[PDB]
Design an enzyme around this catalytic site. Structure first.
Site: not given
Ligand SMILES: [Br-]
Ligand SMILES: [Br-]
Length: 339
Positions: A10, A15, A256, A273
């Site tokens: 991250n 996005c 998210h 994720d």
């Protein structure tokens, strides 16, 4: 790792980017060709093809979450909101335009259209004069309308429906003047790898703002599309297998982003994720993402043609990475490791 696969870091409001990167990484055929690109004469943070080679190499090899800073820098989306200003198909066109471009005049020329390009006929048919206009039109992805649509089959029905050109809106039929006419599209071919964006994020519809539709919209594990083809092939039916579900939780502002994949195409799903990759149920990857009445749902789907599935997902080994590429990366790794 309980999955065998590694995640991506991250590193800001990127996005849909990490989701798209995993999706491309597990298109094994694409990934092999990318490794083959001649990038020896490129500048590391100026070359998109080299940056993608780096990220793929790292996703294939690293046990630690993989960074993308050189990749974002290479295509120039470096700003706080640079990804919020675009959508996933735009990023996808930037990445694989850059790649196909670089592949021109090399031994892997033609890889991208081979995997992703389909053909449509766009037609205009005058109602009361003998004039018809038929065009070949190529596409690399399909934007499907979902508002007021219960499932993917009807989005496709809507896609190929006839539009009426009349009233104020008559068609300019050149020599024939203004004319009432019918306009539409028909599928001629569908590509081995089918990228479908679901138009949940859209418009300035009497609001002059962008909204997210969170209504229920169903898609299947197995997608038969022969029906929408102008002309059918008995030896290669247009049956499609669901490979990826790109997911968003939230609304038209924040939210998210994650992706569900069954990388080997065997119905064994993982959830990616960012840096956390975990095995999940089929139900969680599929039906759980129909949305409806959560704000947690699919905005993009990747299907692979069943006849082409084994080949698109052909195994990649560490030998499929040329040594010259391995050395430039390893040396980069070495420099970085003085920090
Ligand atoms: Br990084
Ligand atoms: Br369905």
């Amino acid at each position: 790792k309980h999955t065998g696969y590694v995640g991506l870091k991250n590193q800001g409001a990127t996005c849909y980017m990490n989701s798209l990167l995993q999706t491309l990484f597990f298109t094994n055929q694409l990934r092999k060709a990318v490794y083959m690109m001649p990038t020896e004469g490129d500048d590391s943070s100026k070359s998109v093809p080299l940056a993608l080679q780096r990220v793929f190499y790292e996703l294939q090899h690293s046990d630690k979450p993989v960074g993308t800073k050189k990749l974002t820098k290479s295509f120039g989306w470096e700003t706080l909101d640079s990804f919020m200003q675009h959508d996933v198909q735009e990023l996808c066109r930037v990445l694989l335009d850059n790649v196909e471009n670089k592949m021109k005049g090399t031994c892997v020329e033609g890889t991208i259209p081979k995997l992703f390009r389909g053909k449509m006929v766009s037609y205009i048919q005058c109602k009361e004069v003998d004039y018809r206009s038929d065009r070949r039109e190529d596409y690399y992805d399909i934007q499907l309308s979902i508002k007021g649509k219960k499932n993917i089959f009807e989005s496709f029905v809507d896609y190929v429906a006839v539009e009426q050109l009349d009233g104020d809106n008559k068609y300019d039929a050149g020599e024939h003047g203004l004319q009432e006419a019918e306009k539409g599209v028909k599928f001629l071919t569908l590509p081995p790898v089918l990228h479908l964006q679901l138009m949940r994020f859209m418009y300035d519809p009497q609001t002059d703002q962008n909204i997210k539709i969170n209504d229920r919209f169903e898609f299947p594990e197995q997608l038969p599309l022969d029906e929408f083809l102008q002309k059918t092939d008995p030896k290669d039916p247009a049956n499609y297998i669901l490979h990826a579900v790109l997911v968003h939780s939230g609304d038209n502002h924040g939210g998210h982003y994650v992706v569900y994949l069954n990388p080997k195409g065997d119905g064994k799903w993982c959830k990616f994720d960012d840096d956390v990759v975990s095995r999940c149920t089929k139900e969680e990857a599929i039906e759980h993402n129909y949305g409806g009445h959560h704000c947690t749902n699919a905005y993009m789907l990747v299907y692979i043609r069943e006849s082409k599935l084994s080949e698109v997902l052909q195994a990649v080994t560490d030998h499929d990475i040329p040594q010259q590429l391995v050395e430039r990366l390893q040396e980069e790794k070495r420099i970085e490791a003085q920090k």
